[PDB]
Design a protein around this ligand. Sequence first.
Ligand code: TTP
Ligand code: TTP
Ligand code: MG
Ligand code: MG
Ligand code: MG
Ligand code: MG
Lengths: 373, 373
Amino acid sequence: ASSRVIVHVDLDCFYAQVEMISNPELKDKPLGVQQKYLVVTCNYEARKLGVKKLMNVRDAKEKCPQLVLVNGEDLTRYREMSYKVTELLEEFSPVVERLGFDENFVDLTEMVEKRLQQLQSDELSAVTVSGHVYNNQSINLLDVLHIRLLVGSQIAAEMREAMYNQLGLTGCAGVASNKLLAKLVSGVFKPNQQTVLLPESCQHLIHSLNHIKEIPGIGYKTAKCLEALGINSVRDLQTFSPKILEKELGISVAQRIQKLSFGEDNSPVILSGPPQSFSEEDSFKKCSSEVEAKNKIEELLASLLNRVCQDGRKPHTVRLIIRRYSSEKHYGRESRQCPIPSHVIQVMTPMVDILMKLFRNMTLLSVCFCNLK
Amino acid sequence: ASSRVIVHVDLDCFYAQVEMISNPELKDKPLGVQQKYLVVTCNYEARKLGVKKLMNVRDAKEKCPQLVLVNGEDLTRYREMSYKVTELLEEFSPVVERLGFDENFVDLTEMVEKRLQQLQSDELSAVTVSGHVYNNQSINLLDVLHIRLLVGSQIAAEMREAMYNQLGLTGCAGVASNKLLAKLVSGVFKPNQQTVLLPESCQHLIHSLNHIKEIPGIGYKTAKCLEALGINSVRDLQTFSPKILEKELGISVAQRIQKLSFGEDNSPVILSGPPQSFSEEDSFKKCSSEVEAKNKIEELLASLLNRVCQDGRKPHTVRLIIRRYSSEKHYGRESRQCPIPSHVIQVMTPMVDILMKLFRNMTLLSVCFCNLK
DNA sequence: AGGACCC
DNA sequence: TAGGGTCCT
DNA sequence: AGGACCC
DNA sequence: TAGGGTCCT
Ligand SMILES: Cc1cn([C@H]2C[C@H](O)[C@@H](COP(=O)(O)OP(=O)(O)OP(=O)(O)O)O2)c(=O)[nH]c1=O
Ligand SMILES: Cc1cn([C@H]2C[C@H](O)[C@@H](COP(=O)(O)OP(=O)(O)OP(=O)(O)O)O2)c(=O)[nH]c1=O
Ligand SMILES: [Mg+2]
Ligand SMILES: [Mg+2]
Ligand SMILES: [Mg+2]
Ligand SMILES: [Mg+2]
């Protein structure tokens, strides 16, 4: 139980893909999906004309005045397609980890080894790769690790074929020996393709990054910190003093981000299984007076009730969340959590009143059901 | 799945019992178990001379200058006897809930019904109670609920017999239709006896309480609150306005404590299973300079390492906890949590250094291992 | 992290 | 005024 | 409850 | 500048 083969699958322009499948007339047209004033994502025809992901509508329509826009506020169809994808991959190997609605990690290590024991001592010389080899690295067919990664590339090609034939969806895959590297290498050939990373190329891939914010796991906060410390490239982070860093971000945050700077990441792929919460949200900037706005709370509820329902399990907790306006409080949401009374779990009319009183102990409103059973 | 039969088992003067079993020469002598300046508990010979539970040593030895004292700082033997008791009860019925080291709830409902279907349509008239009937209530052998509670009293008598024959331990049991009432009724005949509560006596038992702090679930805090609201007896709490209370303690805290004031409590008996944390502590008032005291941290560790070991499972988290002195900050402990590095989980010498740095980001010190797997 | 509650 | 422990926000 | 991180 | 989601302190 040492060397792993992991694949990271990452779909193309996910919400746009789903909209292009719904209305074929949007294909071959530059297409953005809009949520409020945000073009959250756009198909590849639109990225040709300069549309980037997460541009405001304005910036997007003066970079490209001909861009089609569809509303993507309601996530229901993206969410349903996201679970179809995960459940397809779970069929190849049960332990599938989701990240957001369009990425899945799968530990192929068992599956690769069982294919290897199926091949006789001969056809092992005919193993080839499927897709690109990062940094155009030469393969050595006598290196057991290259062999396993290539079988891994083949599983990846079958998963993406299946996603295409069964669900109509294209995407990218990255095959590597842990999750960090599979997820970095899945973006190297962007549109609907796959890349495999051999160990000799690990430092090349990790040094190809131009800022430590690009390392999955280093966020808006830790990045700003690392800077204030003159740590700007991945190599600065690799060479920086362990102690200074230990004693500045916690043992935890420090010992881990420094591993990742090397390309080292031992986190297992975890079975995501069913969601741990179900929430809906609404944005409406400056609209919530402060009592004329609980209706809103009923809207949220309406959908939520249907969703939480359907799963099977019932939630044992309810939560209410807000924010408010003046200057750029860069972070500042508030919430009040409470247990859902047992009579109520077995509908609307009291829920509402749990929320209303929760709302009282109290730009934007949401409701979250959590603690499912 | 409506009416339940629950038993609450509550051992006599637990730590003292254990000490009296270790050193028989302490029997028939008034015995207190001491932790620092606190006589945490005392056997029944000592309660005759005025020793109460949780008296200071001073107050205890001038109420009773002849009282024997043994040190109970080290909990190891009380903890081991506590699990022997729980595992014995789990043998009667698997779902056993612990509360502290010497109380266990068991849902006898399945066990009672299967004994009932074993008795032919005749010997059902010969069912008798074992132990006391709260408030000396008359039994009605044609009341299915009285019958089930009496079979429940008989299971209770077998559990306490078994605890005595197998482990040498005496205790009390309370049989009732939910956990609140079984735990209130287990103290009515205190020393080594058992009481059963029939439904007609529920209001009598709940009104026998002299302050709402006595209701399991209403603590130091909510009690002081309830007062500031003129709510002093259980009847005040029962009659108080639901809304005023809803809108003053949360929907949660309010709707629940008001049920309990009635004797109503639907919480299931939960399987406690293995512990969710392992911690040790040390008190030493004014002793921790502020660097001369990490040794202390090594001591804690030493035992902890042995305990967490033994279970099987390993902990994935470590925590450090403190407090400090001036005036009576009535609540004020602090802690810094961090993940235990994966190399380390498979010993002392780095642990120490996780703690030491945790101690730096930072009257009394403790270490807690949690998040077991 | 800390709060609140239990033994 | 000890030395533990549980679950919630 | 809130923080921090991800898509 | 959206609408979701996960796990930790
Ligand atoms: C990062 C991010 C994505 N999304 C949504 C929109 C995306 O279509 C979807 C997937 O995120 P991504 O995979 O980052 O974006 P993408 O699939 O749209 O584009 P690409 O082809 O480069 O992979 O999740 C958000 O709504 N908010 C976010 O901040
Ligand atoms: C309440 C409490 C108990 N204990 C310990 C000492 C006790 O022996 C043990 C059990 O608690 P209890 O059952 O309340 O006390 P007891 O068994 O000693 O006395 P009784 O015969 O009245 O039931 O837990 C503490 O250490 N601290 C506490 O605050
Ligand atoms: Mg992505
Ligand atoms: Mg994508
Ligand atoms: Mg007790
Ligand atoms: Mg006791």
